[PDB]
Amino acid sequence: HHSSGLVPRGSHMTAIREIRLSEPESAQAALLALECAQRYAEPDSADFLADAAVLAHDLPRAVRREVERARLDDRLHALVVRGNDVDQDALGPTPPHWRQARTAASRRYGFLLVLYASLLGDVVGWATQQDGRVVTDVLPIEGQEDSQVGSSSSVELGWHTEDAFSPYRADYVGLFSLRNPDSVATTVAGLDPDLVGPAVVDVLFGERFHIRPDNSHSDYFAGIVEAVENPRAVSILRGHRDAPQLCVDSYFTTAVDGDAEAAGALDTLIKHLGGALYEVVLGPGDVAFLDNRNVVHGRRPFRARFDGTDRWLKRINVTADLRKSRAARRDAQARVLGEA
Amino acid sequence: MTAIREIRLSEPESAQAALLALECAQRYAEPDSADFLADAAVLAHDLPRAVRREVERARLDDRLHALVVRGNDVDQDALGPTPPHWRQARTAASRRYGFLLVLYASLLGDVVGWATQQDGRVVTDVLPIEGQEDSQVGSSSSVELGWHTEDAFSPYRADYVGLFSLRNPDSVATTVAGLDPDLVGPAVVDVLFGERFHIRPDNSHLPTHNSGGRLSDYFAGIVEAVENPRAVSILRGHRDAPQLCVDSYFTTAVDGDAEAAGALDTLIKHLGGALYEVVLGPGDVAFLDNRNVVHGRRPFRARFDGTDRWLKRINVTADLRKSRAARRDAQARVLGEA
Ligand SMILES: O=C(O)CCC(=O)C(=O)O
Ligand SMILES: O=C(O)CCC(=O)C(=O)O
Ligand SMILES: [Fe+3]
């Protein structure tokens, strides 16, 4: 049976918006994805992406109503849609590297992730991330266990706003779980301004910080070297005091040189978000969209087997405003930030 | 060549759009009722598929001038006379066209209004008013409405302006112009990219074009933008596809910037000449890409007998979230209530 509900975290009453698909809704979504996989080259080929926002309207109406409520909820942490069909037998083993992960068997899940994502905005990728793929792959890679990348395992992926340094950072990060046998969690935290000193909040609204590109990062790539060496003074909080946006990276954010008050406010915020971290576990066929304007995210330490049974998610970036990044894209329809 | 994208509705597609608009009119009070606007994006998806396909092509075309949907059903007899003032233009009979404008608009983005335009109505009215003939507002007639980016002064200016023509018996043209950067050359383009201009609010944001009972403080932001305009660019984004932000009556170069004043002078003559006509007949709805084109309206003689030209107008944003600092609360659509 279909159900939807609001799951609170701390004082965030609509932190998590959860939708459970009925079996007919799951079947309808799967049929649409399979039809797209029959009619279009790739989940992020130009032919499909030109049509993606119209085809997304063919998803179940009850689900579209709930996704639309999430899209306009400026206090959302995560929209979670549970109960999509994943045929584990037909999917086959978890690939050993993202370079081997754009498989024929998994295409239908890429298509479905783009269809859900296109209800929230327009899908984008990054030239420096998994060869500029829009639908990317999150799976453990042997040798990457202790790194601060999505392919890590043994070491906690430190929490951050996705692409925090960038004015073109996504509005949503989408995750479609294909398999997660050991129930490994995405970590999530938002700011509760009622748990932080108003003076600290005032400081975080100041353009008193440097957010440098993470290592996962030419007119465009000139700005990337400049962002490292001569970072612009930016705020961590922006917008309305009642609904501030958050932009911070637990490993790549500093106060401006000599701004001790700003250094203090930043470490107060880092301790607050560290303490407020909670978890979202996506079983097979569960999809989450994190509101990247409101939450930082990471991933818990876990034990990868590297035997083809490991955790595997499809991942996507979504923007509310594709047009605003045109200076960083190759042409009108191209979705790859930093391609030209 | 596809700067103007036209969809002519078949009778069935027109019928389907009308039935959806009437279903909305039966359910909700106003075409900008909060409950309707919450539901609008999903209801918009019930518009004809062929129409949604062409609107989506328009939405992602970053060189679009206007999407024009021709041949919506307008029952002229049932609509009754053109109101003599926008304040009186929220008529029972015209509600269905307000709802339909929002449904089309909600395929392109989220609808917004302004605290300082027609009392913060999201669906506004464009009709001639006695005493406004020679003004630079939408209710003018005798004097050409000078071309402009809608709300050029504001960082929260719309991505699309929607115009639903209810009535246009004398085929009065909307005017449109984009910038071809190649046709003006990289020298002027480089100047127009500089934060070297002042863009002040147009006269529609003044207390004289709102109800007298509206709070003085709604206008504080507008008056500040008139007295002390920020230094801003006219062009932004990619050199291959730059966005345009300029107003023929309210844009100046910053004091002492002779090179900027020259570049502005060149741009005005370029846009003024290329300025071309789109006639919206009854049932025609246009969405102007406000990032790409300035627009205006040709001069005409109003009859003031209830038969005059009448458009419904709406502002559309690609990104409602970005203006949250200027809105009362999450769902509120009226810019400048904060
Ligand atoms: O593995 C996860 O659950 C989250 C992935 C992630 O943090 C990321 O790639 O952005
Ligand atoms: O009357 C027209 O066609 C244009 C109206 C307009 O430019 C406006 O009201 O903003
Ligand atoms: Fe206008």
Numbering used by the authors:
A (entry chain B): -11 to 205, 216 to 338
B (entry chain A): 1 to 338
The authors write:
Structural superposition of CmnC, VioC, and OrfP revealed that three residues, Leu136/Leu156, Ser138/Ser158 and Asp249/Asp270 around the substrate binding site in CmnC/VioC are replaced by Gln142, Gly144 and Tyr257 in OrfP, respectively. To assess whether we could control the substrate stereoselectivity of CmnC, we performed site-directed mutagenesis and created a CmnCL136Q,S138G,D249Y triple mutant, of which the three residues around the substrate binding pocket were mutated as the same with that on OrfP. To illustrate the molecular detail of the engineered CmnC that switched the substrate stereoselectivity, we solved the crystal structures of CmnCL136Q,S138G,D249Y in complex with α-KG (CmnCtriple,α-kg) and d-Arg (CmnCtriple,d−Arg) at resolutions of 1.67 Å and 1.75 Å, respectively. The complex structures of the CmnCL136Q,S138G,D249Y triple mutants revealed almost identical active site environment with that of the wild-type CmnC. The residues involved in Fe and α-KG binding show no significant change between CmnC l−Arg,α-kg and CmnCtriple,α-kg. In contrast, the side chains of Gln136 and Tyr249 in the triple mutant CmnCL136Q,S138G,D249Y make close contact through π–electron interactions. In addition, the water molecule bound by Ser138 in the wild-type CmnC is lost in the triple mutant. The activity assay revealed that the triple mutant CmnCL136Q,S138G,D249Y almost abolished the hydroxylation activity with ∼3% relative activity to l-Arg; however, it showed ∼6% relative activity to d-Arg. Nevertheless, the relative activity of CmnCL136Q,S138G,D249Y for d-Arg hydroxylation is not as high as the wild-type CmnC for l-Arg hydroxylation, implicating that there are more residues participate in the substrate stereoselectivity.
CmnC is an α-ketoglutarate (α-KG)-dependent non-heme iron oxygenase involved in the formation of the l-capreomycidine (l-Cap) moiety in capreomycin (CMN) biosynthesis. CmnC and its homologues, VioC in viomycin (VIO) biosynthesis and OrfP in streptothricin (STT) biosynthesis, catalyze hydroxylation of l-Arg to form β-hydroxy l-Arg (CmnC and VioC) or β,γ-dihydroxy l-Arg (OrfP). The overall structure of CmnC shares similar folds with canonical non-heme iron oxygenases. The catalytic iron is bound by the 2-His-1-Glu facial triad comprised of His148, Glu150, and His295.
